[PDB]
Design a protein around this nucleic acid. Structure first.
Ligand SMILES: [Cl-]
Ligand SMILES: [Cl-]
Ligand SMILES: [Cl-]
Ligand SMILES: [Mg+2]
Ligand SMILES: [Mg+2]
Ligand SMILES: [Mg+2]
Ligand SMILES: [Mg+2]
Ligand SMILES: [Mg+2]
Ligand SMILES: [Mg+2]
Lengths: 101, 89, 102, 89
DNA sequence: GTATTACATGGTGTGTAATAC
DNA sequence: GTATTACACACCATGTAATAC
């Protein structure tokens, strides 16, 4: 099934940098943003944007789409049950239409 | 990729229920982080971060490091991850 | 390998709605957004946001993650050649450091 | 999911090189849209949109409708898509 | 019943620079 | 050499309502 506990991508990166012994200031100088941006990313205050995913993949490995997928799945977990979709109709056959046919 | 089965029942409780009673307290966040990386990766190469120390086992199994010699192992079949384990190797 | 031609997900939906005979106005009334938003989405002028991916999956099927992944892949296709990463250093071993160890 | 092999070489030219000479002009956009859906889907169920009319063949292959009786077929093995074909059925 | 778009608005990511160590 | 954050700013998505059919 789905993972019960999901973390903000920046807080995962902060734990990884801690284990690697890399400061936020050095990480910011490496990937090419200001330490303010890294500090807010690692604190889970701002989202991992498409532009950051390209820079982060060049430093921490993996692909840019992997890092953006972490943020996208995390964004969807926040918006869980926050959008009323009960009034939205699925086009085509519903459950009752699929039984009669 | 989808995690289809767990050999280590503490990982199963953590992944499926958010229950931390089956894993060491000091590694809860790191283990969940690597479970989140496996569940998000669409290909095995997306896990090839150097801190994970990804490498095949000697067939079809893989290993990523949590901390020191503690590692997560799984079997790569059908694009999914089977027999998830957490062991001190 | 990677797909050569990639479409904005809004234009994909517009081609699907046309094949289904569903107007932009009716689609907007269904998923619960104004026709202006659907118009700009279908025209590829605005992005498929996470909130839209939840509404769209409830109408067109599949999962919210699928539709958001389409926009994410499309977003990266615009940017991956626009950001200079030559100065970024990969932590760990480089190509030369992997040869010396072997 | 990764598309590993093409039986229909016109699909291969479209997917790999953006070349449209090997597929009918009427369905270039529709075909590329469904190739993009297959390439993006992480599970077979993410393709189960009612317009696609997703259903398995009678084994291990699947069918996706492009338009009218034209369909895209592929073999689902190892979480990947093999033997991609475009045929009038 | 339909599609498009300027305008005002709100929400968000980023750099600058200040503060504190 | 390090981490945090108010403030200004640019960017972008959305609704309202106008226009046009
Ligand atoms: Cl199990
Ligand atoms: Cl866009
Ligand atoms: Cl091939
Ligand atoms: Mg965030
Ligand atoms: Mg249109
Ligand atoms: Mg694969
Ligand atoms: Mg307003
Ligand atoms: Mg807004
Ligand atoms: Mg400024």
């Amino acid at each position: 099934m789905r993972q019960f506990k999901v973390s903000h991508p920046g807080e995962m990166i902060a734990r990884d940098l801690e284990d690697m012994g890399v400061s936020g200031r050095r990480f910011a100088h490496n990937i090419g943003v200001t330490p303010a941006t890294v500090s807010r990313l690692l604190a889970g205050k701002t989202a991992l944007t498409p532009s950051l995913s390209i820079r982060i993949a060049a430093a921490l490995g993996s692909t840019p789409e992997f890092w953006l997928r972490l943020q996208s799945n995390y964004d969807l977990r926040q918006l869980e049950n926050q959008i009323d979709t009960s009034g939205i109709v699925l086009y085509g056959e519903s459950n009752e239409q699929q039984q009669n046919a | 990729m989808m995690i289809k089965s767990f050999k280590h029942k503490g990982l199963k409780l953590l992944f499926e229920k958010g229950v931390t009673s089956g894993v060491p307290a000091q590694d809860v966040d790191r283990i969940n982080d690597r479970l989140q990386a496996i569940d998000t990766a669409t290909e095995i190469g997306e896990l090839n971060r150097q801190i994970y120390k990804l490498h095949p086992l000697k067939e079809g199994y893989w290993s990523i490091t949590v901390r020191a010699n503690w590692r997560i192992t799984f079997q790569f079949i059908n694009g999914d991850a089977y027999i998830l384990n957490y062991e001190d190797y």
